[PDB]
Amino acid sequence: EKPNIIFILTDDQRFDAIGYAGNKFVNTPEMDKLAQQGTYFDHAIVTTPICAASRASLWTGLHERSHNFNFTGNVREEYMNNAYPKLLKNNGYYTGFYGKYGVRYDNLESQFDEFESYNNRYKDKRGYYYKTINNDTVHLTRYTGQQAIDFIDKNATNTQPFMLSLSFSAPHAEKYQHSLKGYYRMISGIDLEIKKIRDKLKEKGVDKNTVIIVMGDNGYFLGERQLAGKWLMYDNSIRVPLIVFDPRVNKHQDISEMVLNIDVTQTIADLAGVKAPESWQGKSLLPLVKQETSTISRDTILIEHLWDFENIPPSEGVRTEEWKYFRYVNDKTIEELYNIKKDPKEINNLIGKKKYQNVAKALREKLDELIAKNSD
Ligand SMILES: [Ca+2]
Numbered sequence: 473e474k475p476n477i478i479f480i481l482t483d484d485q486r487f488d489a490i491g492y493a494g495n496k497f498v499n500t501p502e503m504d505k506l507a508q509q510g511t512y513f514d515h516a517i518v519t520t521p522i523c524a525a526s527r528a529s530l531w532t533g534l535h536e537r538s539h540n541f542n543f544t545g546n547v548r549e550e551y552m553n554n555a556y557p558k559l560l561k562n563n564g565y566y567t568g569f570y571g572k573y574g575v576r577y578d579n580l581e582s583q584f585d586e587f588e589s590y591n592n593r594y595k596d597k598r599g600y601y602y603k604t605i606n607n608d609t610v611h612l613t614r615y616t617g618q619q620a621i622d623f624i625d626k627n628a629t630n631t632q633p634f635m636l637s638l639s640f641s642a643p644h645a646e647k648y649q650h651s652l653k654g655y656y657r658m659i660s661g662i663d664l665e666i667k668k669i670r671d672k673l674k675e676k677g678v679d680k681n682t683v684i685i686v687m688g689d690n691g692y693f694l695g696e697r698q699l700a701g702k703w704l705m706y707d708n709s710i711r712v713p714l715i716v717f718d719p720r721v722n723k724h725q726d727i728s729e730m731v732l733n734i735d736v737t738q739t740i741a742d743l744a745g746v747k748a749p750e751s752w753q754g755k756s757l758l759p760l761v762k763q764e765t766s767t768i769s770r771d772t773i774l775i776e777h778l779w780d781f782e783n784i785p786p787s788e789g790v791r792t793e794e795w796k797y798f799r800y801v802n803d804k805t806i807e808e809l810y811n812i813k814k815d816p817k818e819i820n821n822l823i824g825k826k827k828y829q830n831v832a833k834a835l836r837e838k839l840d841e842l843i844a845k846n847s848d
Pocket of ligand 1: 482483484485522523644689690
């Protein structure tokens with residue numbers, strides 16, 4: 473009646489960094505199986521390309537304009553409940569988390585083990601669980617992979633459905649020749665854990681009752697613009713691979729070519745039969761996966777932002793099915809506009825030019841008519 477849900481959350485996984493996207497050098501077969509088995513979202517976009525506000529936007533379901541993270545930094549003396557795990561926990565689920573929480577907030581409940589070492593610390597790392605703290609041996613990817621297995625086999629107890637949130641630290645650390653190789657390698661070892669997870673699901677016999685969701689936390693830069701990192705508002709930095717595979721409601725796939733990350737939070741609660749809080753600034757992706765109504769998402773224009781600190785710049789803009797816009801602020805206002813269907817590598821800025829300065833005014837307007845539509 474109610475499905476078990478598993479949200480795999482990869483750290484720094486580009487929308488390009490998956491075989492289903494044509495990448496011939498990754499080895500993500502179980503993910504590729506999930507995309508062909510479920511509905512893949514190629515134009516899945518992350519609102520704020522930072523591995524902490526995005527993760528917070530995942531929890532609280534509100535854009536960074538509305539939550540406003542911090543650095544590091546704890547947030548926000550329980551704003552935030554109004555939070556998709558804590559909601560299912562108090563409505564009818566046995567929630568569980570393993571990996572990087574990314575908010576530094578001192579509570580957490582049900583069953584967990586947050587890897588607080590410095591996220592990373594390669595092999596062996598500090599882990600904040602129940603009662604107190606205890607650090608453990610082998611390597612992040614395998615450790616949080618085995619913990620998910622244990623959570624399925626053991627006590628996620630068979631009465632109420634479980635919602636297991638998995639936050640992998642991989643692949644968080646030409647060009648660099650084969651450091652792009654090692655990046656791709658770290659995503660290949662997550663798939664081994666996906667084989668073991670869904671293999672564990674058949675022993676307990678719930679794989680036809682456990683919808684699995686996979687996402688990349690934010691974009692990346694691998695030599696584009698002679699740039700690394702993320703945080704800017706280019707497609708390779710905001711777009712991530714989001715797989716939503718439901719073994720119950722739709723046996724067969726359908727590829728969707730539309731938008732957005734803050735939707736998963738709604739896609740969790742709606743999935744769990746729980747009324748999604750009024751605060752959450754997303755929309756459910758359930759109509760898309762069971763091929764229901766609004767197969768054009770009806771989210772014609774979306775937002776994205778970066779409220780920033782150290783060196784350097786921030787940005788905020790909006791995107792459409794074939795139009796992009798964003799302007800920095802610290803320290804400047806370099807307005808930029810690109811056409812998405814003809815310039816996907818975003819090398820031709822189109823502002824100033826008279827034939828498209830009217831579509832810049834329509835997007836510059838809708839940006840203000842989207843920044844304040846979230847507010848607080
Ligand atoms: Ca990340």
